[PDB]
């Protein structure tokens, strides 16, 4: 979940393996901006998963 | 802003129609919504849903 490779001095590779958190595309996010989750988010996320 | 005809009186909030419209839906399970009691946004309120009698198109 929470793995990061560029975390050597400098940005170089590390010791770790990239997570789902990074290997995720940054345009599939949707941010809540600190409210409940609901049941109208999830049929935006299936949408955005299934337009690809 | 737009404007909710409550039985009481009228609120605001930042949702578009449209989203109001889907939350007034039968197969819907959420019952609320965020906004204002007044235009200046002072006071924040916690709406119900079943509350709304017509929102101001």
């Given at each position: 979940f929470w793995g990061d490779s560029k975390l050597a001095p400098g940005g170089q590779e590390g010791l770790q393996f990239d997570g789902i958190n990074k290997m995720?595309?940054?345009?599939?996010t949707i941010d809540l901006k600190g409210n409940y989750l609901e049941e109208k988010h999830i049929n935006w996320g299936s949408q955005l998963i299934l337009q690809n | 802003m737009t404007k909710l005809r409550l039985i009481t009186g009228t609120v605001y909030t930042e949702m578009s129609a449209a989203e109001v419209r889907s939350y007034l839906?039968?197969?819907?399970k959420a019952g609320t919504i965020n906004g204002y009691e007044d235009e200046a946004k002072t006071v924040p309120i916690l709406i119900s849903v079943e509350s709304i009698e017509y929102i101001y198109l």
């Open positions: 995720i595309d940054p345009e599939n | 839906q039968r197969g819907s």
